């Protein structure tokens, strides 16, 4: 439920005896956590609302030159001066023009000309600041367990549908607990302050569109700007980067403005994350959490139930959910009520030996009516297998062939881990970690490598990384010396970081 | 007498859009409004499943169409060399004053 | 060439003008334009392979004014375009030029 | 229970065709019948005289 169709579903198995398991909840990826005697709980980060943002220096992109004026001075008669030069809402530039007897002057030479124009911004973009004490991570928890009606509407996040519950994560209250009816309660230990480093991120608001703009990029835009806390007519410091003073032949100095820079600033957001806004709060479409799953109060619902008798019905002919797992729907035709479904994966049907492990642990028929539905998930081994979902003689089966190999899934998990390391970095060592002296020393040397990598290069694009990586690959392919490993590991750590997009 | 050349658009506006989906390994997505040249289009792959209406899990086919509409465009004109009209002012030195 | 953009003109070189990545029609249209190459202003971005967004970029007037680095500008007083630059090559036959 | 995929054509036909030229250094040629997807077209350069 709610994580069975998304292609970025990861399986986090293996705990420290079932106490806690450190996981990273990505924004688009889904996390499936399976246990020994506890039901499988699917986690997915949905929204990230940032509330009560204060504003920072808000730039202008489309200006408008108002009623201008100009005044000239004769050469060796002083310099030019206007009454509207000392105003801060007027732009001004002095120049030296040719002045002669034909222009009314009486001394040939280089004169002095000042053209003044009133700067009037039409449409400005507003950059806001995001505080780390304002993040509200919503977490939708949904166990696999005893699935109801195959798939229910996921908008019922209320007190009904007790297999699902919502979790709101604040840094003011970083621990939370979702009461699952019958299943106990899962405890969360999220660390939202160690998230997507929001002290160096801003929030741009430009023409009913929003972004996640980096701070060092935002403090370096050559555009007119002001303080931020004024909605009226601002002061507009640095006006000279939008108007252009052009004198044709030192006779007439017409100041013309540049165009609307909205297209020039949409092209300058080469790495921003587009966010949305559902009111006063800005919902992000990205990020990653850092959650430890305290599972001591997570107990398995329906262990005391008996098995089923007979008369299953095979509706919704199953398929592979892009990972080797087979999501199977069944319809138990029987009024026994709370019975336990005998599902196992078995080659050599005379023996019925369980060869493939089961994802939805302890499947439970819930409804006590005639036709009670159920939705399971099984992981067959590579090769041929049968989905035997009954007992006795009235059982129904289904042949399934999971194409692939064990080393193919090993290479797929290695590629997935390499992409997870390139996306997250230091947090990638605690995605399936159980704690110890092996998932913390590697995380420590990766934190040292991240401090020696993110601070070293730190400003390269997609193309420039491959451009210096070809140079480092040439330095590793030649130049026979002792320092030959420093130019090959820094090739792979750049190309994997900027190739797996 | 300048002749016009290719005229670019610099300010656009997206009209009413739509996006057709397709079940995986059940064909490809196709819009009935894809047969007009004023509709831009792009094909992509999305995830489909039992919650999304299909009975086959896998990468589906999504085609999104959007009607393109340019409000303000710029126009390039060409220059014929046989139509230049240079104006040359001459001025001899003689009985003239500074106000001439 | 001779650009025309919101009562402004420029002397734009041909090899710069035929390499602009912007949607254009052929200039010979006097109605609704065909707009060849519309994929340079709209941006198709799938969110999480479950929802595909389509958004246009901003008005490219500032991005094309900043791209006209070395183009001289010109005026236009109607159907004729007066230039603010150029150079001639004139031979001054001073045979009939007598002293008054 | 077979669902269709991309279906190809093997016997085509050409309806009433059209062609039009533009003068050199006078722009590129264009038709109003190019604005439909049921028309194929190709731009080329031919000699043009008085």
């Amino acid at each position, epitope marked *: 439920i709610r994580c069975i169709g998304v292609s970025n579903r990861d399986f986090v198995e293996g705990m420290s005896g079932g106490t806690w398991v450190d996981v990273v909840l990505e924004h688009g990826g889904c996390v499936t956590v399976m246990a020994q005697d506890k039901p499988t709980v699917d986690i997915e980060l949905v929204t990230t609302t940032v509330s009560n943002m204060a504003e920072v220096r808000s730039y202008c992109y489309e200006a408008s030159i108002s009623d201008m004026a100009s005044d000239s001075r004769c050469p060796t008669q002083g310099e030019a001066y206007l009454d509207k030069q000392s105003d801060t809402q007027y732009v001004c530039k002095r120049t030296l023009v040719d002045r002669g007897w034909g222009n009314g002057c009486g001394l040939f030479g280089k004169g002095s000309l000042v053209t003044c124009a009133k700067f009037a911004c039409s449409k400005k973009m507003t950059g806001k600041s995001i505080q780390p004490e304002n993040l509200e991570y919503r977490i939708m928890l949904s166990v696999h367990g005893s699935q109801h*009606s*195959g*798939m*229910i*509407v*996921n*908008d019922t996040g209320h007190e009904t549908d007790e297999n699902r519950a919502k979790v709101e994560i604040t840094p003011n209250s970083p621990r939370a607990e979702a009461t699952l009816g019958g299943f106990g309660s899962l405890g969360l230990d999220c660390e939202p302050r160690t998230g997507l480093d929001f002290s160096d991120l801003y929030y741009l608001t430009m023409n009913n569109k929003h972004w996640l703009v980096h701070k060092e990029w935002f403090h370096d835009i050559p555009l007119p700007w002001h303080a931020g806390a004024d909605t009226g007519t601002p002061h507009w410091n640095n006006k000279e980067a939008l108007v252009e003073f052009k004198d044709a032949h030192a006779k007439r100095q017409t100041v013309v403005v540049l165009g609307s820079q909205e297209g020039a600033v949409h092209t300058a957001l080469a790495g921003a994350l587009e966010a949305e806004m*559902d009111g006063a709060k800005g919902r992000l479409s990205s990020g990653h959490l850092k959650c430890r799953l305290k599972m001591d109060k997570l107990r398995l619902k329906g262990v005391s139930y008996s098995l089923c008798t007979a008369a299953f019905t095979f*509706t*919704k*002919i199953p398929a592979e959910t892009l990972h080797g797992t087979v999501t199977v729907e069944v*319809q138990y035709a029987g009024t026994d009520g709370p019975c336990k479904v005998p599902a196992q994966m078995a080659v050599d049907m005379q023996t019925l030996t369980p060869v493939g492990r089961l994802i939805t642990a302890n499947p439970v028929i819930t409804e006590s*009516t*005639e*036709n009670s*539905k159920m939705m399971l998930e099984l992981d067959p081994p590579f090769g041929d297998s049968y989905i035997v979902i009954g007992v006795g003689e009235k059982k129904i089966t289904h042949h399934w062939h999971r194409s692939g190999s064990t080393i193919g899934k090993a290479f797929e998990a290695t590629v997935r881990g390499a992409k997870r390391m390139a996306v997250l970095g230091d947090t990638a060592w605690d995605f399936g970690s159980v704690g110890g002296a092996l998932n913390s020393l590697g995380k420590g040397i990766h934190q040292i490598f991240g401090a020696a990598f993110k601070s070293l290069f730190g400003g390269m694009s997609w193309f420039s990384q491959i451009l210096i990586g070809t140079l480092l690959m040439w330095l590793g392919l030649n130049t026979k010396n002792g320092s030959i490993s420093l130019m090959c590991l820094a090739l792979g750590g750049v190309l994997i970081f900027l190739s797996t997009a | 007498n300048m002749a016009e050349v290719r005229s670019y658009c610099y300010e656009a506006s*997206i009209s*009413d*859009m*739509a*996006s*057709d*989906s*397709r*079940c995986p390994t*059940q064909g490809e*997505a196709y819009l*009935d*409004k894809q047969s007009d040249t004023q509709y831009v289009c792009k094909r992509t792959l999305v995830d489909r499943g039992w*919650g*999304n*209406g*299909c*009975g086959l899990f896998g990468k589906g086919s999504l085609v*999104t169409c*959007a009607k393109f509409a340019c409000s303000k465009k710029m126009t390039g004109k060409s220059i014929q060399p046989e139509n230049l009209e240079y104006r040359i002012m001459l001025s001899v030195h003689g009985s003239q004053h500074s106000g001439m | 060439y001779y650009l025309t953009m919101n009562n402004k003109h420029w002397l734009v070189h041909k090899e710069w003008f035929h390499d602009i990545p912007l949607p254009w029609h052929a200039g010979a249209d006097t109605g609704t334009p065909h707009w060849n190459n519309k994929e340079a202003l709209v941006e198709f971005k799938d969110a999480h392979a*479950k*929802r595909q*967004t*389509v958004v246009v970029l901003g008005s490219q007037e500032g991005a094309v004014h900043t791209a006209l680095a070395g183009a001289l500008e010109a005026e236009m007083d109607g159907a004729k375009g007066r230039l603010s630059s150029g150079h001639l090559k004139c031979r001054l036959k001073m045979d009939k030029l007598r002293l008054k | *229970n*077979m*669902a269709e995929v991309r279906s190809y054509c093997y016997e085509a036909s050409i309806s009433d065709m059209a062609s039009d030229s533009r003068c050199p250094t006078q722009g590129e040629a264009y038709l109003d019948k190019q604005s439909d997807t049921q028309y194929v077209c190709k731009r080329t350069l031919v000699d043009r005289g008085w």
Partner: antibody
Amino acid sequence: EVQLLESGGGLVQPGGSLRLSCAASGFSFSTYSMHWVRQAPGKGLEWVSAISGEGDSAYYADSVKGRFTISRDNSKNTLYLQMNKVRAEDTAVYYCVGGYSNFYYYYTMDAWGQGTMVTVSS
Amino acid sequence: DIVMTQSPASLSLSPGERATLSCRATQSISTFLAWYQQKPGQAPRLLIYDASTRASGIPARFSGSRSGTDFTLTITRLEPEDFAVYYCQQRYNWPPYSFGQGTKLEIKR
């Protein structure tokens, strides 16, 4: 509870344009996809058009394509079915169907309105 | 091109017996069907989600089955306050979903 009130009643003259305004309130309609189902007198039900959760996307049926465009205000949770180019085949009872959609157009539990008497008379 | 056809459209039966209504399809719609319940003069409700599970407040006396492209209703006991017009709905691939035709239920008189 389930309260999908409809408005924009009266008659539609041939040649004009009106708006069927469904006053949807009582749920979070920023995620609920909205649909429009007719009810022909003497015949069955007809599917007309629908709006996805995302604002830009909106589909119609092939018999009514390019005529009836809808608009959703996220600050109002309302609909506006623009009844442009109404012919004599639109004499039916329009409804408003709202269901939750993880994808573009889907619903697991459906809601319904009360209907709108829309007939064509000249 | 998927037209939901209903066969039969009317059954002159008594309240208390069974009733089987089937909706057909042309292409390969696997299971995503939805039945409806429409009284004349009232707002239409549903009957079953995916032809197996009803809505909130609908008893388990009415159910359906899946057989290829045909989906037959299974009604245990017919009540006199339940005879109305029923419809089908498509929820496969991309919309517009195709409705059926309308199945009324008549009684002897």
